[PDB]
Write a protein that binds this ligand. Structure first.
Ligand SMILES: C[C@H]1CN(CCOc2ccc([C@@H]3Oc4ccc(O)cc4S[C@@H]3c3ccc(O)cc3)cc2)C[C@@H]1C
Ligand SMILES: C[C@H]1CN(CCOc2ccc([C@@H]3Oc4ccc(O)cc4S[C@@H]3c3ccc(O)cc3)cc2)C[C@@H]1C
Lengths: 245, 245
Protein backbone atom coordinates (compact mmCIF):
# COMPACT_ATOMS: atom_id res chain seq x y z
CA UNK A 1 0.00 0.00 0.00
CA UNK A 2 3.01 2.23 0.72
CA UNK A 3 5.09 0.80 -2.12
CA UNK A 4 2.19 -0.48 -4.26
CA UNK A 5 1.73 1.67 -7.41
CA UNK A 6 -1.36 3.82 -8.09
CA UNK A 7 -2.23 1.22 -10.71
CA UNK A 8 -1.71 -1.59 -8.12
CA UNK A 9 -3.93 0.12 -5.56
CA UNK A 10 -6.69 0.52 -8.17
CA UNK A 11 -6.51 -3.10 -9.22
CA UNK A 12 -6.25 -4.30 -5.62
CA UNK A 13 -9.36 -2.29 -4.78
CA UNK A 14 -11.32 -3.52 -7.79
CA UNK A 15 -10.35 -7.10 -7.01
CA UNK A 16 -11.56 -6.70 -3.45
CA UNK A 17 -15.11 -5.54 -4.27
CA UNK A 18 -17.81 -7.51 -2.41
CA UNK A 19 -20.70 -9.33 -4.12
CA UNK A 20 -24.14 -7.82 -4.76
CA UNK A 21 -26.55 -9.67 -2.49
CA UNK A 22 -30.26 -10.29 -2.89
CA UNK A 23 -33.15 -9.59 -0.57
CA UNK A 24 -34.49 -12.75 1.05
CA UNK A 25 -38.25 -12.87 0.70
CA UNK A 26 -40.62 -15.09 -1.28
CA UNK A 27 -41.33 -13.37 -4.62
CA UNK A 28 -44.41 -15.46 -5.14
CA UNK A 29 -46.05 -13.71 -2.16
CA UNK A 30 -47.57 -10.22 -1.75
CA UNK A 31 -45.68 -7.20 -0.39
CA UNK A 32 -47.96 -5.58 2.19
CA UNK A 33 -47.18 -8.59 4.39
CA UNK A 34 -43.44 -7.99 4.39
CA UNK A 35 -41.66 -6.06 7.10
CA UNK A 36 -39.72 -3.49 5.08
CA UNK A 37 -37.37 -2.96 8.05
CA UNK A 38 -37.07 -6.73 8.43
CA UNK A 39 -36.14 -7.01 4.76
CA UNK A 40 -33.61 -4.16 4.97
CA UNK A 41 -32.10 -5.32 8.26
CA UNK A 42 -31.63 -8.87 7.06
CA UNK A 43 -29.91 -7.54 3.89
CA UNK A 44 -27.58 -5.27 5.84
CA UNK A 45 -26.58 -8.03 8.29
CA UNK A 46 -25.61 -10.34 5.42
CA UNK A 47 -23.53 -7.58 3.84
CA UNK A 48 -21.51 -7.13 7.00
CA UNK A 49 -19.72 -10.46 6.63
CA UNK A 50 -18.68 -9.57 3.11
CA UNK A 51 -17.64 -6.11 4.36
CA UNK A 52 -15.11 -7.65 6.76
CA UNK A 53 -13.80 -9.75 3.90
CA UNK A 54 -13.47 -6.71 1.72
CA UNK A 55 -11.76 -4.63 4.38
CA UNK A 56 -9.09 -7.30 4.85
CA UNK A 57 -8.27 -6.88 1.17
CA UNK A 58 -7.87 -3.08 1.37
CA UNK A 59 -4.10 -2.42 1.18
CA UNK A 60 -2.76 -1.67 4.67
CA UNK A 61 -5.80 -2.63 6.71
CA UNK A 62 -4.62 -6.01 7.96
CA UNK A 63 -1.23 -4.54 8.94
CA UNK A 64 -3.15 -2.80 11.75
CA UNK A 65 -3.78 -4.48 15.11
CA UNK A 66 -6.99 -6.50 15.49
CA UNK A 67 -8.25 -3.92 17.96
CA UNK A 68 -7.71 -1.04 15.55
CA UNK A 69 -9.34 -2.97 12.71
CA UNK A 70 -12.41 -3.49 14.92
CA UNK A 71 -12.50 0.21 15.79
CA UNK A 72 -12.42 1.43 12.19
CA UNK A 73 -15.17 -0.92 11.09
CA UNK A 74 -17.30 -0.14 14.15
CA UNK A 75 -17.05 3.52 13.16
CA UNK A 76 -17.51 3.21 9.38
CA UNK A 77 -19.84 0.25 8.76
CA UNK A 78 -22.99 2.28 8.06
CA UNK A 79 -21.13 4.83 5.96
CA UNK A 80 -19.70 1.90 3.96
CA UNK A 81 -23.13 0.28 3.45
CA UNK A 82 -24.60 3.63 2.43
CA UNK A 83 -21.97 4.61 -0.16
CA UNK A 84 -22.46 1.11 -1.56
CA UNK A 85 -26.20 1.69 -1.83
CA UNK A 86 -25.82 5.12 -3.39
CA UNK A 87 -23.37 3.66 -5.89
CA UNK A 88 -25.64 0.88 -7.17
CA UNK A 89 -28.57 3.33 -7.14
CA UNK A 90 -26.80 5.82 -9.44
CA UNK A 91 -28.37 4.54 -12.66
CA UNK A 92 -31.85 4.47 -11.11
CA UNK A 93 -33.08 8.05 -10.70
CA UNK A 94 -35.58 8.44 -7.87
CA UNK A 95 -34.89 4.94 -6.59
CA UNK A 96 -32.62 3.13 -4.17
CA UNK A 97 -31.34 -0.26 -5.33
CA UNK A 98 -31.09 -1.99 -1.95
CA UNK A 99 -30.76 -5.22 -3.93
CA UNK A 100 -31.43 -6.22 -7.55
CA UNK A 101 -34.82 -7.55 -6.39
CA UNK A 102 -35.48 -4.71 -3.98
CA UNK A 103 -35.67 -1.31 -5.66
CA UNK A 104 -37.57 1.27 -3.62
CA UNK A 105 -38.74 4.85 -4.24
CA UNK A 106 -39.30 7.56 -1.60
CA UNK A 107 -42.97 6.79 -1.12
CA UNK A 108 -41.94 3.22 -0.25
CA UNK A 109 -39.86 4.68 2.57
CA UNK A 110 -42.84 6.44 4.15
CA UNK A 111 -43.88 2.93 5.17
CA UNK A 112 -41.41 3.34 8.04
CA UNK A 113 -41.66 6.18 10.54
CA UNK A 114 -38.80 8.62 10.00
CA UNK A 115 -37.30 6.61 7.13
CA UNK A 116 -38.34 8.87 4.23
CA UNK A 117 -35.95 11.48 5.63
CA UNK A 118 -33.03 9.05 5.27
CA UNK A 119 -34.23 7.86 1.85
CA UNK A 120 -34.33 11.46 0.63
CA UNK A 121 -30.76 12.07 1.72
CA UNK A 122 -29.50 8.85 0.06
CA UNK A 123 -31.45 9.68 -3.07
CA UNK A 124 -29.88 13.10 -3.22
CA UNK A 125 -26.38 11.61 -2.83
CA UNK A 126 -27.03 9.14 -5.69
CA UNK A 127 -28.10 12.04 -7.94
CA UNK A 128 -24.90 13.94 -7.09
CA UNK A 129 -22.82 10.91 -7.99
CA UNK A 130 -24.75 10.73 -11.24
CA UNK A 131 -24.25 14.46 -11.86
CA UNK A 132 -20.54 14.07 -11.24
CA UNK A 133 -20.32 10.98 -13.42
CA UNK A 134 -18.51 9.16 -10.64
CA UNK A 135 -16.38 6.25 -11.93
CA UNK A 136 -16.05 2.72 -10.55
CA UNK A 137 -12.36 3.36 -9.98
CA UNK A 138 -13.10 6.52 -7.99
CA UNK A 139 -15.85 4.86 -5.96
CA UNK A 140 -13.54 2.09 -4.65
CA UNK A 141 -11.00 4.67 -3.58
CA UNK A 142 -13.67 6.62 -1.78
CA UNK A 143 -15.00 3.55 0.02
CA UNK A 144 -11.49 2.68 1.13
CA UNK A 145 -10.96 6.23 2.48
CA UNK A 146 -14.15 5.94 4.52
CA UNK A 147 -12.86 2.72 6.08
CA UNK A 148 -9.51 4.22 7.05
CA UNK A 149 -10.59 7.79 7.88
CA UNK A 150 -13.79 7.53 9.85
CA UNK A 151 -12.51 6.31 13.19
CA UNK A 152 -8.88 7.43 13.01
CA UNK A 153 -9.50 10.54 15.17
CA UNK A 154 -11.27 8.61 17.94
CA UNK A 155 -8.64 6.11 18.98
CA UNK A 156 -8.73 6.62 22.76
CA UNK A 157 -5.26 6.33 24.33
CA UNK A 158 -1.99 7.19 22.62
CA UNK A 159 0.54 4.43 23.14
CA UNK A 160 3.68 4.07 21.04
CA UNK A 161 1.88 1.37 19.05
CA UNK A 162 -1.19 3.60 18.66
CA UNK A 163 0.97 6.42 17.33
CA UNK A 164 2.52 4.03 14.79
CA UNK A 165 -0.92 2.84 13.67
CA UNK A 166 -2.11 6.37 13.06
CA UNK A 167 0.99 7.14 11.02
CA UNK A 168 0.46 4.09 8.82
CA UNK A 169 -3.21 4.90 8.28
CA UNK A 170 -2.42 8.48 7.22
CA UNK A 171 0.26 7.04 4.93
CA UNK A 172 -2.26 4.73 3.28
CA UNK A 173 -4.74 7.60 2.92
CA UNK A 174 -2.00 9.63 1.18
CA UNK A 175 -1.51 6.77 -1.30
CA UNK A 176 -5.23 6.58 -2.12
CA UNK A 177 -5.11 10.35 -2.67
CA UNK A 178 -2.23 9.83 -5.09
CA UNK A 179 -4.30 7.10 -6.75
CA UNK A 180 -7.35 9.33 -7.23
CA UNK A 181 -5.20 12.06 -8.71
CA UNK A 182 -3.56 9.50 -10.98
CA UNK A 183 -6.92 8.24 -12.15
CA UNK A 184 -8.08 11.73 -12.95
CA UNK A 185 -4.91 12.64 -14.84
CA UNK A 186 -5.18 9.46 -16.90
CA UNK A 187 -8.73 10.50 -17.84
CA UNK A 188 -7.42 13.74 -19.28
CA UNK A 189 -8.48 16.34 -16.65
CA UNK A 190 -6.27 19.40 -16.22
CA UNK A 191 -4.23 19.98 -13.07
CA UNK A 192 -6.95 22.38 -12.04
CA UNK A 193 -9.83 19.98 -12.73
CA UNK A 194 -7.98 17.28 -10.80
CA UNK A 195 -7.74 19.11 -7.53
CA UNK A 196 -11.24 20.49 -7.95
CA UNK A 197 -12.61 16.97 -8.58
CA UNK A 198 -10.66 15.55 -5.64
CA UNK A 199 -12.24 18.16 -3.39
CA UNK A 200 -15.70 17.52 -4.83
CA UNK A 201 -15.36 13.78 -4.04
CA UNK A 202 -13.96 14.24 -0.56
CA UNK A 203 -16.64 16.75 0.36
CA UNK A 204 -19.31 14.17 -0.42
CA UNK A 205 -17.77 12.04 2.31
CA UNK A 206 -18.89 14.68 4.80
CA UNK A 207 -22.47 14.11 3.61
CA UNK A 208 -22.11 10.35 3.88
CA UNK A 209 -20.93 10.77 7.50
CA UNK A 210 -24.03 12.93 8.05
CA UNK A 211 -26.34 10.21 6.68
CA UNK A 212 -24.70 7.54 8.78
CA UNK A 213 -25.05 9.65 11.94
CA UNK A 214 -28.70 10.37 11.17
CA UNK A 215 -29.30 6.71 10.27
CA UNK A 216 -27.74 5.50 13.50
CA UNK A 217 -30.00 7.92 15.40
CA UNK A 218 -33.00 6.54 13.47
CA UNK A 219 -32.01 2.87 13.81
CA UNK A 220 -31.42 3.48 17.55
CA UNK A 221 -35.11 3.45 18.40
CA UNK A 222 -36.28 0.27 16.68
CA UNK A 223 -36.39 -3.55 16.89
CA UNK A 224 -33.49 -3.79 14.43
CA UNK A 225 -30.90 -5.67 16.46
CA UNK A 226 -28.61 -4.73 19.35
CA UNK A 227 -27.81 -8.20 20.68
CA UNK A 228 -24.16 -8.71 21.62
CA UNK A 229 -22.33 -5.39 21.30
CA UNK A 230 -21.00 -4.55 17.86
CA UNK A 231 -17.35 -4.57 18.99
CA UNK A 232 -17.48 -8.16 20.13
CA UNK A 233 -19.29 -9.32 16.98
CA UNK A 234 -16.74 -7.59 14.71
CA UNK A 235 -13.89 -8.99 16.77
CA UNK A 236 -15.27 -12.51 16.39
CA UNK A 237 -15.46 -12.01 12.65
CA UNK A 238 -12.12 -10.33 12.25
CA UNK A 239 -10.19 -12.53 14.78
CA UNK A 240 -10.09 -15.51 12.44
CA UNK A 241 -7.85 -18.54 12.79
CA UNK A 242 -5.89 -19.61 9.75
CA UNK A 243 -6.92 -23.29 9.84
CA UNK A 244 -9.02 -23.13 6.72
CA UNK A 245 -5.90 -22.05 4.80
CA UNK B 1 -15.79 34.90 -5.80
CA UNK B 2 -15.89 33.52 -9.35
CA UNK B 3 -13.61 36.22 -10.75
CA UNK B 4 -11.88 37.15 -7.47
CA UNK B 5 -8.25 35.93 -7.41
CA UNK B 6 -6.93 33.27 -5.00
CA UNK B 7 -5.15 36.13 -3.27
CA UNK B 8 -8.44 38.13 -3.16
CA UNK B 9 -10.37 35.21 -1.69
CA UNK B 10 -7.72 34.78 1.03
CA UNK B 11 -7.75 38.45 1.93
CA UNK B 12 -11.54 38.62 1.77
CA UNK B 13 -11.73 35.65 4.14
CA UNK B 14 -9.16 37.06 6.56
CA UNK B 15 -10.95 40.40 6.57
CA UNK B 16 -14.22 38.69 7.38
CA UNK B 17 -13.06 36.84 10.51
CA UNK B 18 -15.36 37.36 13.52
CA UNK B 19 -14.20 38.67 16.91
CA UNK B 20 -13.10 36.48 19.84
CA UNK B 21 -15.77 36.86 22.50
CA UNK B 22 -15.51 36.47 26.26
CA UNK B 23 -17.48 34.36 28.67
CA UNK B 24 -19.92 36.42 30.72
CA UNK B 25 -19.56 35.55 34.39
CA UNK B 26 -18.26 37.45 37.41
CA UNK B 27 -14.56 36.61 37.84
CA UNK B 28 -14.61 37.78 41.41
CA UNK B 29 -16.94 34.88 42.29
CA UNK B 30 -16.31 31.13 42.74
CA UNK B 31 -16.78 28.53 40.00
CA UNK B 32 -18.75 25.67 41.55
CA UNK B 33 -21.73 28.04 41.50
CA UNK B 34 -21.62 28.56 37.75
CA UNK B 35 -23.69 26.54 35.31
CA UNK B 36 -21.05 25.31 32.88
CA UNK B 37 -23.77 24.67 30.28
CA UNK B 38 -25.23 28.11 31.02
CA UNK B 39 -21.81 29.65 30.45
CA UNK B 40 -21.23 27.70 27.22
CA UNK B 41 -24.74 28.28 25.88
CA UNK B 42 -24.61 32.01 26.50
CA UNK B 43 -21.22 32.16 24.69
CA UNK B 44 -22.47 30.21 21.69
CA UNK B 45 -25.63 32.33 21.34
CA UNK B 46 -23.55 35.54 21.25
CA UNK B 47 -21.28 34.04 18.59
CA UNK B 48 -24.20 33.33 16.32
CA UNK B 49 -24.84 36.99 15.56
CA UNK B 50 -21.23 37.46 14.56
CA UNK B 51 -21.45 34.24 12.51
CA UNK B 52 -24.23 35.71 10.35
CA UNK B 53 -22.11 38.80 9.87
CA UNK B 54 -19.16 36.71 8.86
CA UNK B 55 -21.13 34.56 6.46
CA UNK B 56 -22.39 37.64 4.62
CA UNK B 57 -18.75 38.51 3.96
CA UNK B 58 -17.87 35.09 2.51
CA UNK B 59 -17.55 35.62 -1.27
CA UNK B 60 -20.70 34.35 -3.01
CA UNK B 61 -22.88 33.78 0.04
CA UNK B 62 -25.07 36.87 -0.24
CA UNK B 63 -25.64 36.22 -3.95
CA UNK B 64 -27.80 33.29 -2.80
CA UNK B 65 -31.49 33.72 -1.95
CA UNK B 66 -32.38 34.54 1.66
CA UNK B 67 -34.00 31.13 1.98
CA UNK B 68 -30.87 29.32 0.83
CA UNK B 69 -28.67 31.41 3.12
CA UNK B 70 -30.90 30.39 6.05
CA UNK B 71 -30.66 26.73 5.05
CA UNK B 72 -26.87 26.64 4.87
CA UNK B 73 -26.45 28.31 8.24
CA UNK B 74 -29.12 26.13 9.85
CA UNK B 75 -27.13 23.13 8.66
CA UNK B 76 -23.59 24.33 9.45
CA UNK B 77 -23.80 26.55 12.55
CA UNK B 78 -22.51 23.98 15.05
CA UNK B 79 -19.79 22.76 12.70
CA UNK B 80 -18.74 26.41 12.28
CA UNK B 81 -18.66 27.06 16.05
CA UNK B 82 -16.70 23.85 16.60
CA UNK B 83 -13.98 24.43 13.98
CA UNK B 84 -13.63 27.89 15.51
CA UNK B 85 -13.15 26.36 18.95
CA UNK B 86 -10.68 23.76 17.75
CA UNK B 87 -8.74 26.50 15.97
CA UNK B 88 -8.27 28.75 19.01
CA UNK B 89 -7.56 25.66 21.13
CA UNK B 90 -4.67 24.52 18.89
CA UNK B 91 -1.93 26.14 20.98
CA UNK B 92 -3.37 24.78 24.23
CA UNK B 93 -2.72 21.03 24.37
CA UNK B 94 -5.29 19.17 26.48
CA UNK B 95 -7.53 22.21 26.70
CA UNK B 96 -10.40 23.85 24.87
CA UNK B 97 -10.28 27.64 24.66
CA UNK B 98 -14.01 28.36 24.68
CA UNK B 99 -13.05 31.97 25.40
CA UNK B 100 -9.86 33.70 26.56
CA UNK B 101 -11.30 33.63 30.10
CA UNK B 102 -12.78 30.16 29.77
CA UNK B 103 -10.19 27.47 29.13
CA UNK B 104 -11.38 23.98 30.08
CA UNK B 105 -9.75 20.54 30.26
CA UNK B 106 -11.49 17.16 29.85
CA UNK B 107 -12.11 16.68 33.55
CA UNK B 108 -13.98 20.01 33.50
CA UNK B 109 -16.30 18.48 30.91
CA UNK B 110 -17.27 15.57 33.17
CA UNK B 111 -19.23 18.20 35.08
CA UNK B 112 -21.90 17.74 32.40
CA UNK B 113 -23.48 14.37 31.68
CA UNK B 114 -22.30 13.10 28.29
CA UNK B 115 -20.16 16.17 27.61
CA UNK B 116 -16.72 14.61 28.17
CA UNK B 117 -17.34 12.51 25.06
CA UNK B 118 -17.74 15.68 22.96
CA UNK B 119 -14.78 17.37 24.68
CA UNK B 120 -12.58 14.39 23.86
CA UNK B 121 -13.51 14.55 20.19
CA UNK B 122 -12.86 18.33 19.99
CA UNK B 123 -9.59 17.87 21.84
CA UNK B 124 -8.50 15.23 19.40
CA UNK B 125 -9.35 17.49 16.43
CA UNK B 126 -7.31 20.37 17.94
CA UNK B 127 -4.31 18.03 18.31
CA UNK B 128 -4.62 16.96 14.66
CA UNK B 129 -4.66 20.60 13.57
CA UNK B 130 -1.57 21.11 15.69
CA UNK B 131 0.08 18.01 14.22
CA UNK B 132 -0.67 19.25 10.72
CA UNK B 133 0.52 22.76 11.53
CA UNK B 134 -2.69 24.17 10.11
CA UNK B 135 -2.32 27.80 8.97
CA UNK B 136 -4.66 30.75 9.54
CA UNK B 137 -5.07 31.06 5.79
CA UNK B 138 -6.06 27.40 5.48
CA UNK B 139 -8.45 27.56 8.44
CA UNK B 140 -10.53 30.40 6.91
CA UNK B 141 -10.85 28.47 3.68
CA UNK B 142 -11.98 25.41 5.58
CA UNK B 143 -14.56 27.35 7.59
CA UNK B 144 -15.93 28.84 4.39
CA UNK B 145 -16.21 25.36 2.80
CA UNK B 146 -18.20 24.14 5.80
CA UNK B 147 -20.64 27.03 5.36
CA UNK B 148 -21.19 26.34 1.66
CA UNK B 149 -20.94 22.54 1.64
CA UNK B 150 -22.86 21.31 4.65
CA UNK B 151 -26.43 21.85 3.53
CA UNK B 152 -25.99 21.92 -0.24
CA UNK B 153 -27.15 18.29 -0.66
CA UNK B 154 -30.34 18.78 1.38
CA UNK B 155 -32.08 21.53 -0.51
CA UNK B 156 -35.57 19.99 -0.83
CA UNK B 157 -37.20 20.82 -4.18
CA UNK B 158 -35.37 21.44 -7.43
CA UNK B 159 -36.69 24.55 -9.12
CA UNK B 160 -34.84 26.36 -11.88
CA UNK B 161 -33.67 28.87 -9.27
CA UNK B 162 -32.62 26.06 -6.93
CA UNK B 163 -30.57 24.46 -9.69
CA UNK B 164 -28.84 27.81 -10.34
CA UNK B 165 -28.06 28.22 -6.63
CA UNK B 166 -26.44 24.82 -6.44
CA UNK B 167 -24.32 25.56 -9.48
CA UNK B 168 -23.08 28.82 -7.98
CA UNK B 169 -22.27 27.18 -4.65
CA UNK B 170 -20.24 24.43 -6.33
CA UNK B 171 -18.50 27.15 -8.34
CA UNK B 172 -17.54 29.01 -5.17
CA UNK B 173 -16.34 25.77 -3.57
CA UNK B 174 -14.13 25.17 -6.64
CA UNK B 175 -12.58 28.63 -6.15
CA UNK B 176 -11.80 27.96 -2.48
CA UNK B 177 -10.19 24.69 -3.60
CA UNK B 178 -8.06 26.67 -6.05
CA UNK B 179 -7.23 29.04 -3.19
CA UNK B 180 -6.08 26.26 -0.86
CA UNK B 181 -3.91 24.79 -3.58
CA UNK B 182 -2.49 28.24 -4.28
CA UNK B 183 -1.68 28.75 -0.63
CA UNK B 184 0.10 25.44 -0.45
CA UNK B 185 2.12 26.04 -3.60
CA UNK B 186 3.18 29.45 -2.32
CA UNK B 187 4.44 27.75 0.85
CA UNK B 188 6.73 25.55 -1.20
CA UNK B 189 4.97 22.13 -1.09
CA UNK B 190 5.40 19.84 -4.09
CA UNK B 191 2.52 19.02 -6.42
CA UNK B 192 2.26 15.76 -4.55
CA UNK B 193 2.28 17.31 -1.08
CA UNK B 194 -0.37 19.79 -2.23
CA UNK B 195 -2.99 17.26 -3.19
CA UNK B 196 -2.14 15.12 -0.19
CA UNK B 197 -2.52 18.13 2.14
CA UNK B 198 -5.77 19.16 0.46
CA UNK B 199 -7.16 15.69 1.10
CA UNK B 200 -5.90 15.69 4.69
CA UNK B 201 -7.74 18.99 5.36
CA UNK B 202 -10.97 18.01 3.65
CA UNK B 203 -11.08 14.68 5.45
CA UNK B 204 -11.03 16.50 8.78
CA UNK B 205 -14.29 18.13 7.72
CA UNK B 206 -15.90 14.70 7.88
CA UNK B 207 -14.86 14.53 11.55
CA UNK B 208 -16.21 18.00 12.24
CA UNK B 209 -19.57 16.94 10.75
CA UNK B 210 -19.43 13.92 13.07
CA UNK B 211 -18.86 16.14 16.14
CA UNK B 212 -21.66 18.47 15.17
CA UNK B 213 -24.08 15.55 14.70
CA UNK B 214 -23.08 14.06 18.05
CA UNK B 215 -23.26 17.50 19.70
CA UNK B 216 -26.73 18.15 18.33
CA UNK B 217 -27.81 14.76 19.69
CA UNK B 218 -26.31 15.70 23.08
CA UNK B 219 -27.71 19.25 23.13
CA UNK B 220 -31.12 17.83 22.14
CA UNK B 221 -31.89 16.55 25.63
CA UNK B 222 -31.13 19.61 27.75
CA UNK B 223 -32.43 23.02 28.91
CA UNK B 224 -30.19 24.77 26.36
CA UNK B 225 -32.71 26.66 24.27
CA UNK B 226 -35.24 25.65 21.61
CA UNK B 227 -37.52 28.69 21.73
CA UNK B 228 -38.62 29.94 18.31
CA UNK B 229 -37.39 27.51 15.65
CA UNK B 230 -33.88 28.08 14.37
CA UNK B 231 -35.03 28.83 10.80
CA UNK B 232 -37.14 31.77 11.86
CA UNK B 233 -34.43 33.19 14.13
CA UNK B 234 -31.80 32.96 11.35
CA UNK B 235 -34.22 34.49 8.88
CA UNK B 236 -34.84 37.43 11.20
CA UNK B 237 -31.11 37.96 11.50
CA UNK B 238 -30.30 37.48 7.86
CA UNK B 239 -33.38 39.35 6.45
CA UNK B 240 -31.99 42.76 7.35
CA UNK B 241 -33.23 46.08 6.02
CA UNK B 242 -30.66 48.47 4.65
CA UNK B 243 -31.78 51.52 6.65
CA UNK B 244 -28.71 51.65 8.84
CA UNK B 245 -26.62 52.08 5.67
C1 LIG C 1 -24.17 -4.54 10.34
C2 LIG C 1 -25.11 -4.07 11.45
C3 LIG C 1 -26.51 -3.67 10.94
N1 LIG C 1 -27.50 -4.40 11.76
C4 LIG C 1 -28.64 -3.58 12.23
C5 LIG C 1 -29.58 -3.01 11.15
O1 LIG C 1 -28.85 -2.12 10.28
C6 LIG C 1 -29.42 -1.59 9.17
C7 LIG C 1 -30.83 -1.67 8.99
C8 LIG C 1 -31.38 -1.11 7.83
C9 LIG C 1 -30.59 -0.43 6.87
C10 LIG C 1 -31.34 0.15 5.66
O2 LIG C 1 -31.15 -0.76 4.55
C11 LIG C 1 -29.96 -0.89 3.89
C12 LIG C 1 -29.68 -2.15 3.38
C13 LIG C 1 -28.48 -2.40 2.72
C14 LIG C 1 -27.57 -1.33 2.50
O3 LIG C 1 -26.42 -1.63 1.84
C15 LIG C 1 -27.87 -0.06 3.01
C16 LIG C 1 -29.02 0.17 3.77
S1 LIG C 1 -29.37 1.54 4.32
C17 LIG C 1 -30.96 1.56 5.15
C18 LIG C 1 -31.15 2.47 6.35
C19 LIG C 1 -30.11 2.87 7.21
C20 LIG C 1 -30.46 3.71 8.27
C21 LIG C 1 -31.79 4.13 8.48
O4 LIG C 1 -32.10 4.92 9.54
C22 LIG C 1 -32.82 3.74 7.62
C23 LIG C 1 -32.47 2.88 6.55
C24 LIG C 1 -29.22 -0.31 7.09
C25 LIG C 1 -28.65 -0.91 8.25
C26 LIG C 1 -26.75 -4.75 12.99
C27 LIG C 1 -25.41 -5.23 12.41
C28 LIG C 1 -24.33 -5.43 13.47
C1 LIG D 1 -26.63 29.26 17.92
C2 LIG D 1 -27.54 28.25 18.61
C3 LIG D 1 -26.91 27.62 19.88
N1 LIG D 1 -27.90 27.78 20.98
C4 LIG D 1 -28.10 26.57 21.81
C5 LIG D 1 -26.88 26.08 22.62
O1 LIG D 1 -25.80 25.71 21.73
C6 LIG D 1 -24.58 25.37 22.21
C7 LIG D 1 -24.40 25.10 23.59
C8 LIG D 1 -23.13 24.75 24.04
C9 LIG D 1 -22.02 24.62 23.16
C10 LIG D 1 -20.69 24.21 23.80
O2 LIG D 1 -19.89 25.41 23.95
C11 LIG D 1 -19.31 26.05 22.88
C12 LIG D 1 -19.19 27.43 23.00
C13 LIG D 1 -18.64 28.19 21.97
C14 LIG D 1 -18.14 27.53 20.82
O3 LIG D 1 -17.61 28.32 19.84
C15 LIG D 1 -18.26 26.13 20.71
C16 LIG D 1 -18.91 25.38 21.70
S1 LIG D 1 -19.04 23.87 21.61
C17 LIG D 1 -19.80 23.17 23.07
C18 LIG D 1 -20.69 21.95 22.92
C19 LIG D 1 -21.41 21.64 21.76
C20 LIG D 1 -22.18 20.47 21.78
C21 LIG D 1 -22.25 19.64 22.93
O4 LIG D 1 -23.02 18.54 22.94
C22 LIG D 1 -21.51 19.95 24.09
C23 LIG D 1 -20.74 21.13 24.06
C24 LIG D 1 -22.22 24.84 21.81
C25 LIG D 1 -23.52 25.23 21.34
C26 LIG D 1 -29.19 27.97 20.27
C27 LIG D 1 -28.79 28.96 19.16
C28 LIG D 1 -29.88 29.16 18.11
Amino acid sequence: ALSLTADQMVSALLDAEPPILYSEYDPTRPFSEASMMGLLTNLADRELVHMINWAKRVPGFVDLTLHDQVHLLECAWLEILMIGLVWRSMEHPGKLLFAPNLLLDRNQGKCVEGMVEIFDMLLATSSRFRMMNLQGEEFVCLKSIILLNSGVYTFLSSTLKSLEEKDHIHRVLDKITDTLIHLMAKAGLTLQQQHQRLAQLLLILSHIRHMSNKGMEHLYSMKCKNVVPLYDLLLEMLDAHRLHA
